[PDB]
Every structure is written in C-alpha cells, then in structure tokens.
C-alpha cells in the first residue's frame, strides 16, 4: 500500500516495449494509480582505435558503439498485488529493479 518505483535499463529495444506494456497491462486490470513510463535520454559508449595489429601503413581509425536505453515507472499498489507480478515478467538481457523510496 506504498508508493513504489521501478527501473529497467536494457539494451534490446524490441525487448523493452513488451515488458513495459505488460507492466502497465496488469496494473490497469487492477486499476492502480500510476504515472506513465518516462523514457530517459539514452547513453552511447565509444572507443577509437586504429585498425592495424602492427604499425606499418596508412592512418585512419575505427569507432565502436554500444547503446544503453533506460526508462522507469512510478507506481502505488498493495504489496500482495505487486510482489507476484514482478516475478512473471522475466526475459534474458533485461534488468528489473524495485524502489519503494517514500522519504
């Protein structure tokens, strides 16, 4: 019966809109109070490294990339409602977290 907050920061964007849909699905079949999935600015990683094992040759480089997407939802529910549904929305590559911060 406490306001909670869930985060999920994954790297397969197709496998994050199935999870964020079924989160808001079973909450709205029980019709709790909620606020929509707020989508944060994504983070990209990069490292320039030149493309030769030895050093003998012409010079330009590579650039590698890795994309991290992160979005989070706030929620309030009785604890018996939420403690079951957070255990049936598992999927590989996906991270789930629960925050009950009510300072």
């Amino acid at each position: 019966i406490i306001k909670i907050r869930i985060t999920l920061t994954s790297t397969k964007v197709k496998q994050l809109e199935n999870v964020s849909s079924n989160i808001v699905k079973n909450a709205e079949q029980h019709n709790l109070v909620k606020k929509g999935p707020v989508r944060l600015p994504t983070k990209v990683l990069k490292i320039s490294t030149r493309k030769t094992p030895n050093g003998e040759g012409s010079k330009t480089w590579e650039t590698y990339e890795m994309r991290i997407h992160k979005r989070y939802i706030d929620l309030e529910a009785p604890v018996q409602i939420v403690k079951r549904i957070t255990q049936i929305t598992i999927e590989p590559g996906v991270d789930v977290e629960v925050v009950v911060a009510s300072n």
Binding site: P53, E62, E65
Partner: protein
C-alpha cells in the same frame, strides 16, 4: 598486465575492462560493441 598477443602497452584502461587492443578487435563483438558509423 600483459594479457596475450605481444602487448603490455596500449591497454584500454577506460570502462574498467583492461584489454590489450590487439586482442580487442576480435573480442569486441561478444562484449556487445558493434560499429555503425
């Protein structure tokens, strides 16, 4: 450390992975780095 492929120099100290860069191009796939641009 000197990891493998005749390298103790040019290590990638960033992002806490510590790989010799000769042996990064063949391992950058399965880490999950990919080139796009």
């Amino acid at each position: 450390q000197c990891r493998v492929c005749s390298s103790h120099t040019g290590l990638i100290r960033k992002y806490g992975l510590n790989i010799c860069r000769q042996c990064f191009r063949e391992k950058a796939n399965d880490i999950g780095f990919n080139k796009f641009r």
